[PDB]
Paper text:
For targets with antiparallel helices, short loops are sufficient.
Encouraged by the successful design of sc-apCC-6 and sc-CC-7, we extended the seeded design approaches to target α-helical barrel proteins with five, six and eight central helices. Together, these additional designs delivered the de novo proteins sc-CC-5, sc-CC-6 and sc-CC-8. For the parallel targets, the experimental structures show minor fraying at the C termini of the inner helices compared with the seeds and models, which appears to improve the packing of the external three-helix bundles.
Residue numbers in the entry: -1 to 55, 58 to 225, 228 to 309
């Protein structure tokens, strides 16, 4: 309850560091990169702290690890911004450590039958593939991009199958979290297409993002008649807009970049509206998630202007 809210706060903070690290890449602004770097290690330390507390007491532990994975992603971006091979190699170590913690926590969450914690660990696995995809870009590592690609395909196939089993359980939060995982899988694929200069894989990631976008939009109005599953469907839509912008970057397509930017503006409006409503009614976890959705729309806009 309280440990969940601390984790969501940190996840929001890390998303702000990622937005800053992204802008530093666009502008070549190294002061911005050093700044984000200090913020991302502050976040990772606080997140590494909350992960021990929640384990020594499960949903907040996976949320703490998500924050760690998001901090590691900001590290990989800063390494791209500064051209720092040492930092990239540090991000590689940090990401594999996340991948190990998220594979173990995912394994026992399926045995224990904890559907939300499993969906949350599966998300952290997808975050690890994203981080590895960025380390591949920084280092020029083809084999690491292939490792990332194979990771993202496993997440996709398993999130799709576990999503249909959450439809048969009436677990709408897990249904949203598995949609988010498929959206993160599309993000990892567009990054690997960028890293490999691969056009067929970007066309693949594009078909995947459009599938998630259509499904998350439908599930969002269905949930509108939860308030948490509602905000999670919005996050999924924001994450799909991020993948569209990435494919607009990888294919050098401007109509796709305009379409990605227009969806990001649409989600932002809806999230601001919903967050206003959740604030007045005291839906603190929902307000947190709508906050997270605005952050993701901001990241999508950054990429959309880079394209």
């Amino acid at each position: 309850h309280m440990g969940i809210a601390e984790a969501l706060k940190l996840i929001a903070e890390a998303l702000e560091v990622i937005a800053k690290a992204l802008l530093a890449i666009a502008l070549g602004d190294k002061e911005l990169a050093k700044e984000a770097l200090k913020e991302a290690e502050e976040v990772k330390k606080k997140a590494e702290k909350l992960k021990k507390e929640a384990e020594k007491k499960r949903i907040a532990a996976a949320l703490a690890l998500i924050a760690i994975a998001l901090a590691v992603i900001a590290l990989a971006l800063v390494a791209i911004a500064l051209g720092d091979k040492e930092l990239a190699k540090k991000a590689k170590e940090e990401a594999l450590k996340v991948l190990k913690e998220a594979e173990k926590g995912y394994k026992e969450a399926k045995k224990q039958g904890d559907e939300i914690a499993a969906a949350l660990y599966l998300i952290a696995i997808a975050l690890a593939a994203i981080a590895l995809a960025l380390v591949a870009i920084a280092l020029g590592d083809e084999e690491l991009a292939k490792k990332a690609k194979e990771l993202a395909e496993k997440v996709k196939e398993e999130a799709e199958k576990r999503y249909k089993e959450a439809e048969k359980q009436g677990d709408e939060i897990a249904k949203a979290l598995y949609l988010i995982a498929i959206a993160l899988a599309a993000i990892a694929l567009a990054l690997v297409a960028i890293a490999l200069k691969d056009e067929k894989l970007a066309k693949e990631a594009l078909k995947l993002a459009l599938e998630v976008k259509k499904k998350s939009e439908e599930e969002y109005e269905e949930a509108k008649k939860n308030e948490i599953a509602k905000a999670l469907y919005l996050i999924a839509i924001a994450l799909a807009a991020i993948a569209l912008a990435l494919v607009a970057i990888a294919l050098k397509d401007e109509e796709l970049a305009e379409e990605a930017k227009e969806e990001a503006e649409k989600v932002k409006e809806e999230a601001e509206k919903q967050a206003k409503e959740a604030k007045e009614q005291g839906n603190e976890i929902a307000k947190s998630l709508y906050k997270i959705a605005i952050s993701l729309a901001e990241i999508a806009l950054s990429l959309a202007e880079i394209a």
